């Protein structure tokens, strides 16, 4: 019994999105502020993830995908199928058969533009600017939007390097 410890985040995040909604009617506010708070979140968890894994750093793209799928595996307990590889291979698609942030919130959030993975964006984004990766993120497909399966698409841009020590 009491196997699943974590079905409380799918409803904590639900409370977040509902109250952000009731505060600001705009569908994109509850996306961007939610993304920046999930960004600080990613800052806060990448430190512990590297504390356990002791990975050197994401100097390469495939190893970065491995580290990120490992991060999802350890905390959010989902297996990101790394697919859709670009010929330049600067980008890769994360295939989540089951959303880990939610467990069946519902397919209609009554209205579109309600980006339901903004923390996930922070989850993927924040760590990068902490592991020194100036990287852009965006979602190519969301099963929650009436779709079969959720794919994310994250594009590294500039190797963040420390300056003027």
């Amino acid at each position: 019994a009491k196997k699943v410890n974590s079905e409380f985040l799918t409803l904590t995040y639900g409370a977040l999105v509902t109250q952000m909604l009731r505060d600001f009617e705009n569908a994109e506010d509850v996306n961007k502020q939610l993304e920046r708070i999930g960004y600080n979140m990613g800052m806060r968890l990448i430190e512990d993830f590297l504390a356990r894994t002791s990975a050197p750093r994401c100097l390469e793209m495939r190893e970065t995908a491995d580290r990120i799928q490992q991060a999802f595996r350890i905390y959010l307990n989902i297996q990101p199928t790394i697919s859709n590889w670009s010929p330049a291979s600067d980008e890769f698609s994360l295939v989540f058969d089951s959303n880990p942030l939610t467990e069946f919130v519902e397919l209609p959030p009554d209205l579109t533009n309600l980006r339901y993975s903004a923390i996930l964006s922070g989850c993927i984004r924040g760590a990068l600017e902490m592991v020194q990766l100036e990287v852009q993120c965006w979602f190519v497909q969301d099963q929650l939007k009436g779709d079969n399966v959720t794919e994310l698409r994250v594009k590294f841009v500039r190797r963040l390097e420390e300056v003027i020590p």
């Binding site: 800052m43 806060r44 990448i46 430190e47 512990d48 590297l50 504390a51 356990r52 002791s54 990975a55 050197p56 750093r57 994401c58 902490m130 592991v131 020194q132 420390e162 020590p165």
Partner: protein, 145 residues
């Protein structure tokens, strides 16, 4: 392993935190300029070891040892820097500093809502946890490799 003192600096280069247990020689210059001098110390060391190494630096610099003390270093992939300092004789302290990082600093800095990155870490709770954690196996020495 009881040690002289520990330094924690953010990737930007500010003094996140300092800890002292055995530092005997008390400097005359301020420990702030001392912290900045240590950070320049470390970054220029990293450049030196990166460039004069004939083979790929995976984690770069490890430590330096002197006549009378020794200094040990830890680079996080986050860019955070830990540095410890003590006398000579002990187990290698790379895993020691890693254990301190994971078990204490991650536990009692990052997890604190009061802790906001980009600032100093001032909390008696973390000072305690760090103190008793160094006092966990606290004989002495380094001889780090």
């Amino acid at each position: 392993m009881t040690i002289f003192n520990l330094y924690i600096f953010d990737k930007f280069g500010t003094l996140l935190h300092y800890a002292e247990w055995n530092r005997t020689k008390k400097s005359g210059i301020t420990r702030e300029e001392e912290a900045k001098l240590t950070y320049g110390m470390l970054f220029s060391i990293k450049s030196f070891v990166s460039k004069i190494s004939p083979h790929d630096p995976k984690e770069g610099f490890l430590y330096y040892k002197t006549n009378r003390y020794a200094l040990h270093y830890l680079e996080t992939p986050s860019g955070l820097k830990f540095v410890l300092n003590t006398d000579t004789t002990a187990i290698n302290v790379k895993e020691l500093l890693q254990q301190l990082y994971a078990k204490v600093w991650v536990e009692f800095v990052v997890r604190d809502p009061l802790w906001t990155p980009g600032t100093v870490v001032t909390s008696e709770l973390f000072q305690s946890k760090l103190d008793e954690f160094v006092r966990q196996s606290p004989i002495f020495g380094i001889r780090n490799i």
